[PDB]
Amino acid sequence: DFLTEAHLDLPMEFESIGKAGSRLGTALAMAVDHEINMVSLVRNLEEFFARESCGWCTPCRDGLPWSVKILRALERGEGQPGDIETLEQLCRFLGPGKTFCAHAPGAVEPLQSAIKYFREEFEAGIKQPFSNTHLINGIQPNLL
Amino acid sequence: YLPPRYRGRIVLTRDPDGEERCVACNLCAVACPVGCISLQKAETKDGRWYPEFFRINFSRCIFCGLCEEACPTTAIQLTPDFEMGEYKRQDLVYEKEDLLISGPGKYPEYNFYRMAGMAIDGKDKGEAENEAKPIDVKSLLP
Amino acid sequence: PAWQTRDHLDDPVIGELRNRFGPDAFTVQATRTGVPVVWIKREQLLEVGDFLKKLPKPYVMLFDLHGMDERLRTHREGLPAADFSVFYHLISIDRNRDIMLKVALAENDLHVPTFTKLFPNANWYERETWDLFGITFDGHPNLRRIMMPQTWKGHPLRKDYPARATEFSPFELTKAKQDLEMEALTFKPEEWGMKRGDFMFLNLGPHGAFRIVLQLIVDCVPDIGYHHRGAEKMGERQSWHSYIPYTDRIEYLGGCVNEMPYVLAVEKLAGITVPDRVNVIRVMLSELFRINSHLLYISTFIQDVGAMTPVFFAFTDRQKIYDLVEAITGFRMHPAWFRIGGVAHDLPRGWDRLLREFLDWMPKRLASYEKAALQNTILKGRSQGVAAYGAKEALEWGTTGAGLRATGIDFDVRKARPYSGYENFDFEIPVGGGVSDCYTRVMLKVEELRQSLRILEQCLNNMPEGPFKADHPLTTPPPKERTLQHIETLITHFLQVSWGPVMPANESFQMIEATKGINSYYLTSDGSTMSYRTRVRTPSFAHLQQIPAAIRGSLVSDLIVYLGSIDFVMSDVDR
Amino acid sequence: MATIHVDGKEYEVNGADNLLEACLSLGLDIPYFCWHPALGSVGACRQCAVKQYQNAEDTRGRLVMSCMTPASDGTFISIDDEEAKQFRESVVEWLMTNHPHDCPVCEEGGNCHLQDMTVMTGHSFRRYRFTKRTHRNQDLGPFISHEMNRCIACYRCVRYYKDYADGTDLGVYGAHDNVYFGRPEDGTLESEFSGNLVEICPTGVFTDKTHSERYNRKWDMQFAPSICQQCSIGCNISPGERYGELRRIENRYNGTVNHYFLCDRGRFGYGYVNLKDRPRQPVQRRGDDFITLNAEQAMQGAADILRQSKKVIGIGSPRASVESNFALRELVGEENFYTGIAHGEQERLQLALKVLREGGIYTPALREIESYDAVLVLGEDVTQTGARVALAVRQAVKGKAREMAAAQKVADWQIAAILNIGQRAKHPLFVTNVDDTRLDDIAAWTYRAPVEDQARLGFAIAHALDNSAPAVDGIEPELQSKIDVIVQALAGAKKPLIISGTNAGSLEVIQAAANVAKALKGRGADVGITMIARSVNSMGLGIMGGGSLEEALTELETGRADAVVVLENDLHRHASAIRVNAALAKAPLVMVVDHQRTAIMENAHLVLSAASFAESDGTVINNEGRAQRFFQVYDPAYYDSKTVMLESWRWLHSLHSTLLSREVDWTQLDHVIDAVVAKIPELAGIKDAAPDATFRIRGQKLAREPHRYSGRTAMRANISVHEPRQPQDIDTMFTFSMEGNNQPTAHRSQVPFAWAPGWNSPQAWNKFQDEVGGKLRFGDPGVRLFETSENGLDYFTSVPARFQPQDGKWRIAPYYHLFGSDELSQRAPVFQSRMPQPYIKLNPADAAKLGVNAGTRVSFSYDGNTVTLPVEIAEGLTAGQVGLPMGMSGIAPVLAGAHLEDLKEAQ
Ligand code: SF4
Ligand code: SF4
Ligand code: SF4
Ligand code: SF4
Ligand code: SF4
């Protein structure tokens, strides 16, 4: 999970990074500066995680490509208003014990932290309304 | 004067490309409460499902329109025409040549095969709506 | 929600039953009927029944009495061990509450004591239960077959009895010649009713066709069952969705009024609360059909006892109502437009101008009807005191509708137990001065027709926005535009129209105010895609049962006038 | 054993089971894809998710998978928990993102497990707006079509094909969301059990190609409980009919015999019913002209000539029912009744019967085979004849890995852990044949030898197990070493299985297998023995008895038999064609009662239009000795009114009454079965195989059609718009309609088809079982005619001499094929391409002496005839032998063990 400048001055132990909302991992840290768009950074991360799925279990094999396609829409500015709430649901349902191994829980850990700390750049992607259906002549639709 | 939604004579319609719209899925036959539809699926060398025969017993039909609303291709529709009458009850049994009309009827633009994943002539894999190109397992890209 | 499963233990009728018979003398069933359901033993049936008749706010009316087979019912958790059952639906007007009593039976001993002494309307109901099932009601005076002919072997609502005509041998006319010879030799063996008796026994056959054997009036005996279509049996051989056309043909004038109790009952088994636009659309179609039926009753009433020359203009007005119905639904009669969860389509875009043209057109005609009927003297003189009854006679024979309202009992279903969003409308309930006769009933209908037009005025000006179908997985069928493009919607539509929607195992019950009286649907689900038991309570059955009690002491002309005044149709009576 | 708490309620369940198979047995609906009762739990699809609490007071727990979670004592789970329900809906939503819009044109529609689970979760609204992934398809042969777009990646196909069925040519390819299930390249699926993939796959990826030619939905089918007629195993089947033609073959669950799986010959070999060449009316010859008769005319015409005859003989068939052979036996008398099989085939069948009835060794059912610890297969090429036994033997060989895992406290359902512990360790399996078999990949040792050499190894194993058994002198040290390997595995086994059969064509191999079983029985082992017979009612016709076909042909050509009534028999398979056609020309009256068009009906004087198994009722007795009833699927007179197809027992009983008293008697089925029980005590069990036609489920008759059956007023409306009466069944408890009972909890054993509310797929069989993967709820249909005898037999001392080649004479080594060797199923058009080209197999040294190579057409002489075949080369075939394909068009199965006098290159 991503951490902020406020999360420095904090020791590099397993339970100290654990109480800060993240995991200590390999202990090799990566710095993100002010010129990297967070949505593009997460989209690069999820693209790696989606394509490195072994394909055994459904919420990794099929859940993660949906997250990638939403982030590509957010990065280009084609995001729809239900998209961010889908990313939240994906993170909840790809947690520990719901998938077959720990690959998928590790994949959603950057995604859920970046929405929590940087929601404004994710909200900036939403510039188009919701439409996943096309009109059919002679059939009046069900108007919500 | 008849309204557009009038429930008279039952026809089978055609695609805008000119093929028959019925894919012989048998949903209209099972959804009919009177059991007045019999049909059998046939398949072209192209791979397109179509009805070998389509038979409606209009002596039994009550014109409820449950067949039209069951159809997932808009092939079967009810038209504003009540002009029917016969000397023999056997002549109330209509075959596919008495039912298949020259155009699309009430829904001018819907084509089911454009939606469907199944491959027929003119639509190979990835040529349907919201469908990507097939990627082989041997592809170099991960 | 208004559909969740309830045991109704907080109803005050159960506590006084506990304090009278003990806690071990009955058993409470949790249903979705909206009423308490209690299983009693047949040795206590009469004691429990006469106890509810002298409660301090007593249950005065036996709504329905019929049976269930129950042998093939797999989901029977909590019920006592039954091979057959008989249910008794009772109604208290002063509490605005109902109770249902269920008596369990074994397959060898189909015997229960008759309920006729307490409630007189039970006589025809027990004969039908004897006809369609094989339950014998001990103490019944003339327990003969009321639906099928007297040589018919077999009880057609038993689950071992085959439903379809194709399963039997066809009309080879071996039995047609014998029935023709029997009908030709129409003689009285003094078995067709009480038949105590010098006396001229005459059969007279006349909006429906039925026979009656009259003593020349010393004794009259209706013979019904000539219009039995097996609608109740048909519910067992049709899915929940494909049964919907059969609902429209219980009453021909009813149309979408007839579909309303069935879809509301199925929606209780499904657990569906519909949107507001569905409520206003369903109320709109039901008040249009109610206006059409009331104009038919007023029209035909003026023609038989009066000059029919001015009132023939009402045909043009009924043509306008049929053109508006087939503009909305598609077809003039038997629309089959109500769906589980909604309606079949949305309203077409030019509906408002046609309805506004009908609402502008109607008051001039309506005020001409009021002038033609309220102020007339000849028909009023031929309709006052002609086979009258009061409040005590209405509640005994289960008479509802304009009859019951013509007495002082203000009981509508749209106000007492609101359904389909009727409680968000401004309308009044007309009521008589305590005497129900031929003049009072017609005057009440003219007042009801004006209130129905008020409901249609609020529907055009307060038509809300949104869907015509609920968003729920048991909404059958799904919206078609989503079905034509989306696979999960296509999958739901595929299984719903073919195998059927799966209703979980429960019992639901809805009552509506019909065009004539109160029509209800009591549906039982065994967890399958078809109904296990479908019960249709029609008010015309009770109204036609009431006529020998009131016509006794009158002429044949009074019989014809009384039959023309009562709200009875034989499709309702025989189903 | 264990008590678990589900959704507040409390239940009693088996502790060894996992939570999915515990809760499905109680009637709690949990959705699932990747789990199968036969295959075990792997945990892939994540659809079976439930919320598990630590105790009764824990309010916030965790989501587990019920297929992967043991049902321990003290378990607290909630299926209807809101977080569990949302997740289960999401799993369906994730599978729906890439699924094609194909349900109207998908053959799985209405019978699709994915359709049922999508509705059951309650996911009906699409949110995904992006593109769908697509796949190209493969050609998988004439039986199975391929549509990879519909795949949900549940991995059931590969787990069935590689792990369970031990096929080698199906795998998973790719990675992430691009996983592809199929073959490495296009071509026919090589496994004999490939066709179970249509039931195993929960979607429409693998579908029946033979059914998609004449497709109809499941609700329009008419079903009956039937038995497979293609070999002797007796697999229970549910054939479906629409518009008067048999449409598909479905597996009918029977927990004692076949359970979830059929072989490919059973599943796809049904096409002979649908032939246009079958006789539909009785036909009487007049010189060259042919006259069509009705049922009354045929009986009066036949019995006039039969009254004038001085002796009438009857020829039965192994592929005819017990009621049909007995009625034939009742018409000519038991002194004049012949079985219709050759004398040598008759001698092997009654010896096979003798060891089952009098050997004192229990004969296991087809599912009981999977519990045995050692298997010796002597002579029976069991994959090609009796294919479901080979599937059952593969599961028995995997019992070693189950024993190791049980010692390490791994649960029985955790299949990937058990397979990892195993690591190619197998229970020992020793097979003997004339060439290589399809069991060679799992066999501890294969022995390719002539049939006398296979018997001589069998007698030597018995002598090395017991001193009292007769010995085989002349065994070389190389073979002697291997005999010690087999004997130490057999004697060290706790439960050995001995398999042989009549298809090897040797009396001595069957004698050697009873000696091995006797020697193991004396040691204290719980030994079972299994014999495979040739046809569906081979064991039933052997219990009835009669003289051989050769004796019948003698009585014809020596003038004593004036007439002959052949019943469902093509005599060319069992005896020489030239002898049969000569002896049927001397007879004044030849009568044939067959449902198939055969060569002997050209010169026949009267042909009666017999019914096939789809149009008939009757009892067949399988290789185990179990009597099983098969019911009629459809009335053939309903659609075509000129069709006079009656049962063979109904034609022969009526003919006997017209012969006696000039009045036809169309009898009922229970009267014929009652007649069998009185006259033949050995067939007394057939009365209890099924109930009679007065059996009712609370007054209801058992339904053949699903309750949503369609087209009642339009099916026959092109002939007459007036609806005909529904066909009436007086023979059985079933009705030719949908107005009847098919409840899962109905007290019956004969289930025509499985359907439940919310379960339209083959997964609806879970509602009909007591525990899932167990037995049917009220017992599996079928009864064993004989129990194990108190005392056994003596040792057979008839040891054959060692095989020696001869110059000129060539021994015929039998080769069998699943798609060619059976009489009815080789006439199916879909089997014409699946069967191989006719060949002749030679040793390389013998083809070098003959001067030929692979592909050379060679000519030989059998019985004065000449057949030319192309040569194939067989290294495992020993010299002096000649491989022929048995049961083809031209090569009769009586040729096994025969000799070819002349062999030379064709010119
Ligand atoms: S979560 Fe693990 S097991 Fe599941 S698909 Fe991803 S990598 Fe494979
Ligand atoms: S008309 Fe429509 S529902 Fe009927 S078979 Fe054709 S496509 Fe299917
Ligand atoms: S309109 Fe109704 S009765 Fe007529 S064919 Fe269609 S479903 Fe059957
Ligand atoms: S596999 Fe099932 S869900 Fe998919 S298209 Fe076929 S029937 Fe529909
Ligand atoms: S092909 Fe069928 S069985 Fe195999 S993984 Fe795909 S859906 Fe499952």
Ligand code: SF4
């Ligand atoms: S093993 Fe024999 S009985 Fe079973 S399906 Fe195969 S051919 Fe039929």
Ligand code: FES
């Ligand atoms: S069925 Fe349990 S995870 Fe697939």
Ligand SMILES: [Ca+2]
């Ligand atoms: Ca029969």
